[PDB]
Each structure stands twice: as structure tokens, then as C-alpha cells.
Design an enzyme around this catalytic site. Sequence first.
Site, PDB file in Angstrom:
ATOM      1  N   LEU A 209       0.832  -1.201   0.000  1.00 60.65           N
ATOM      2  CA  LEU A 209       0.000   0.000   0.000  1.00 60.65           C
ATOM      3  C   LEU A 209       0.870   1.256   0.000  1.00 60.65           C
ATOM      4  O   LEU A 209       0.621   2.208  -0.753  1.00 60.65           O
ATOM      5  CB  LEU A 209      -0.929   0.009   1.207  1.00 60.65           C
ATOM      6  CG  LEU A 209      -1.742   1.289   1.374  1.00 60.65           C
ATOM      7  CD1 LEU A 209      -2.625   1.579   0.156  1.00 60.65           C
ATOM      8  CD2 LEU A 209      -2.602   1.188   2.636  1.00 60.65           C
ATOM      9  N   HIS A 210       1.898   1.262   0.847  1.00 61.34           N
ATOM     10  CA  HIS A 210       2.832   2.389   0.893  1.00 61.34           C
ATOM     11  C   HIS A 210       3.458   2.692  -0.477  1.00 61.34           C
ATOM     12  O   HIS A 210       3.538   3.858  -0.896  1.00 61.34           O
ATOM     13  CB  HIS A 210       3.923   2.157   1.953  1.00 61.34           C
ATOM     14  CG  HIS A 210       5.034   3.153   1.897  1.00 61.34           C
ATOM     15  ND1 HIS A 210       4.848   4.497   2.151  1.00 61.34           N
ATOM     16  CD2 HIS A 210       6.351   2.998   1.622  1.00 61.34           C
ATOM     17  CE1 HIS A 210       6.005   5.126   2.028  1.00 61.34           C
ATOM     18  NE2 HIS A 210       6.929   4.241   1.697  1.00 61.34           N
ATOM     19  N   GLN A 211       3.895   1.646  -1.178  1.00 65.38           N
ATOM     20  CA  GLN A 211       4.457   1.814  -2.518  1.00 65.38           C
ATOM     21  C   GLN A 211       3.452   2.480  -3.438  1.00 65.38           C
ATOM     22  O   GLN A 211       3.787   3.375  -4.222  1.00 65.38           O
ATOM     23  CB  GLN A 211       4.823   0.460  -3.130  1.00 65.38           C
ATOM     24  CG  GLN A 211       5.857  -0.357  -2.390  1.00 65.38           C
ATOM     25  CD  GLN A 211       6.161  -1.655  -3.134  1.00 65.38           C
ATOM     26  OE1 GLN A 211       5.961  -1.745  -4.352  1.00 65.38           O
ATOM     27  NE2 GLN A 211       6.633  -2.663  -2.410  1.00 65.38           N
TER      28      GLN A 211
ATOM     29  N   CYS B 268       2.038   9.082   3.339  1.00 67.23           N
ATOM     30  CA  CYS B 268       2.098   8.035   2.325  1.00 67.23           C
ATOM     31  C   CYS B 268       2.146   6.634   2.939  1.00 67.23           C
ATOM     32  O   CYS B 268       2.417   5.667   2.250  1.00 67.23           O
ATOM     33  CB  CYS B 268       3.246   8.253   1.333  1.00 67.23           C
ATOM     34  SG  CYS B 268       4.855   8.463   2.084  1.00 67.23           S
TER      35      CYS B 268
END
Length: 181
Positions: free
Chosen positions: A27-29, A169
Site C-alpha cells: 500500500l505504501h508503494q 504516504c
Amino acid sequence: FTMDHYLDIRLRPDPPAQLMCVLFGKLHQALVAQGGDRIGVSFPDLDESRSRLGERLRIHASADDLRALLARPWLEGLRDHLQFGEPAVVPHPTPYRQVSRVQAKSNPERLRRRLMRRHDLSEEEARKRIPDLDLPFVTLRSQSTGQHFRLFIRHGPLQVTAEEGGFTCYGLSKGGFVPWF
RNA sequence: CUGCCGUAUAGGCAG
């Protein structure tokens, strides 16, 4: 309130803690790639009483932002180890709460190194000045230096109205709250 | 963990 859509992602058996970390990292990516600050997360099956996030990740966003996020293939590869709800408008009314990264002064030595950079002291001086978290977390890797670190997460007090602020993020609060249900 | 902000042994933050 504009972040009124959501998707629930639940883990499928295989281990759970490790799988949540992979999912949270993916998800972060995806958030970094999109570059925005209006996608939030919560962990609705949270057990703060055992420092467990639970096995459900909820993603929160406007209709348009959720659709854009989901259009990218950031999950394919993990898809077989996840079970999905449908992107939907949230129930209402619900309370709101803040899902925050929490950090602590857990390493005085690191504090001393900085204090030495900022006051030109010596270690014995620093050590005299700066003498020697119980939250759920995910374990993430620092993509620049390959260092693993724990990111501790707090779900704060419920409240009746929302906020204007945004999100990091990692999907965590920079002021923004998400609906809790 | 590593670093950033801050006089801070204030309160925050980045990956």
C-alpha cells in the site's frame, strides 16, 4: 465529509502478522507512486488490549481517489492471500477517529549523538544530560538503507465530527480522521 | 534502527 468511500481487505491463512506487513508495504508503494495525501487506513478488527492490528485493513478515500488507487495493479501477486469486500460508501452516521503513527524517545544514545551535533559536547557530557511504546505495529524496511523498523500505530479517541487534515504516504494521519465502524 | 525539527533531559517528524 469527503473521504466517504472505503474498501476492506482481509488476510487469508498461510503467517498473519507477516502478511499484514507485506500488504501494508505494498500500500505504501502505491501511495508513494500516486503522490497524494488523501488516502487513509484503519484496522477495524483492532485489539489494542493485546497490541494486535487484527486481520482487516480498511482503506478510506473519496470515490475518485479510491477508484484511482484500485485501478493500479499494486495487489496482484498478493491477491491469492487476500479476500476483498466491494468499494462502497461508508455507513452513516458513524464516529470518526485518528489513526496515527506514534514515535517515542526510546533510544537515549541516538538522542546523545544529536545533542553532541547541536551543542558540541562530549559523550560524558551528553550521557550526563540524557541518562538511561505499548502499541500495535507493523515492521517495515527502509528502502534506502535496508534497515527494518517498527512503525507503531495508535487509533485515537472516537469523536462525532471529522477533520480537514490530510494523510501520510503510509495512510496515517497528518491531521485527517477516518470514519470508524 | 538511522536521521530531521527544537535551548530542551519540551513537543513533534522522516524512511
